[model samples]
Target: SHMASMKKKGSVVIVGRINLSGDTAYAQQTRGEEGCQETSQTGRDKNQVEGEVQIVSTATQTFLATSINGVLWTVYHGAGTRTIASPKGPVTQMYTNVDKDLVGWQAPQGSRSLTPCTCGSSDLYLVTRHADVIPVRRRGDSRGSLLSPRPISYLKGSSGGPLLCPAGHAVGIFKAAVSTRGVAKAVDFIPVESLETTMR
Candidate 1:
């Protein structure tokens, strides 16, 4: 049993200037009708993909991670210059089945730790596409790997999804499933601590 607080309704008020009559000095730049047409045409090709997994959020290096074919990858959108392309690639993968919990990438010098001090033997939870939480148990500890005994094949489309520790902090990212006879009996994931870095 745990004690908690509630969010009271209408307990706070907002007091700000409401100006709807005139345009602001710093308004968005206007694009001509031809520019709009071209932009709309290009937007047609934009489609919904898996999704994004934000790792770092400092101004120096804001990064995101995603999965491609059971492998974890990172994409950089950090503060820097332009003109540099292909700033993303596979970062983690499984090597052998024997050491399933100790394979793939390891974090460098100063990566942030994702585990909370309050997190103990409690089961971790997985976020699903339909806005649901699935509780899972940890099998072992490794630099990048996080194994689960339960099958999460039903969450197939949720690759690169979130895995929250008991304290509701993000600790791992869903990668792939370890299956037997076409049924996943175990799961694989990339521990979030292994995919992060300090601002310094």
Candidate 2:
């Protein structure tokens, strides 16, 4: 349980439909038997799910976050999941964790793409909201790869993060990497799309 695990760790801030009335709101959801069901299943009173959450995953290597919209949209890999700290407050509505396939089966052209990681100098940082360039190269005519060139090969606590384009369109989520002395120390992005396009 994220609540039991989060014991006295951080402050739980709730605002709007996103609340901490229960621990379920803190659990990380993946594509389980229920599939990618409603996040604020109790449903938001408003139309669009808007807000941000920094999911400090317990099991995975790095912390993950999702852009808040009509629903909280983010991705995770090799997951367990977080705490109750919000940019907004009061802990109101009930939410659930997800475990789903949660990927865009097909969208459009995705090649020569680059994402950024807002990162810090390895140890100087506790929270690595890091940034770097990741190249999305095509495997011939096959699907394009979305993880190439992570500046910090030894970077930690950055798994399951977002890979956003210049316009802040989420290209994918951060997964893993292979490090080196230049020559493209590549990392990986588990390809994802906005929920509006993904469930299609």
Candidate 3:
């Protein structure tokens, strides 16, 4: 069982919704057509983009985002999955993380910076679309670190949310939740430093 705690300050405020492009590619909802009837048409809706992007800086309309948006092109489409091509231009608009399923987005319009936290360094907590915060702990000694007490399926829409440190700075973005036998085990993430790695 998971323990319950009060919502973390500034964590939920930084999360925002995003609408990814390529709706037609996944427009066909598999309802009862697939073997898993319990999960039939249960996946992300074709038109409803459930992406929860972390607002790195709303003042600049900057967000730590995903590559599944319209601006990116598909690289391969086969075997029930597809790969996205990398960004071809400078890191001004969209910064692509090569070989990693991560991307940075500069939104079309700038807004007021909601959360007080800054993206820097993280017992951290991750933001969710439900305005909830997930308790996590750094589990590795690497630049690209991992977070434990792996998030469950409830955190599905929180893909691009922020993993914030106690001091309120963002340590990284929630990339993927490592799961086994349909249960989450840990979280794999791209460190905040990668932003500098790309901009430099």
In order of appearance, the predictions have TM-scores of 0.39, 0.37, 0.47
Candidate 1 vs 3: which has more lDDT: 3
Report lDDT (Cα) of residue 152, candidate 1: 48
Better candidate by lDDT, 2 or 3: 3
Each model's C-alpha lDDT? 0.36, 0.33, 0.39
Per-residue lDDT of candidate 3, residues 107-184 (tens digit) = 322222223235443466766544456677767622222344444666565555566677645566566677777656
Q: Where does model 3 exceed 4 Å of error? A: 1-93, 112-122, 141-151
Task: For candidate 2, write residues 42-159 as lDDT tens digits.
Answer: 2111222222333332221334444423233333342322232222321221222344423211111111112223331111101123433344543321123434344564345455
Output the worst ten-in-a-row residue range by lDDT, candidate 2: 104-113
Error of 3 at 193 (Å): 0.9
- Least accurate stretch of 10 residues (summed lDDT) in model 3? 73-82
* Model number with the top lDDT: 3
Clashes of each: 0, 23, 1
lDDT of 1 at 109: 20
Q: What residue pairs are clashing in model 3?
A: 122-165
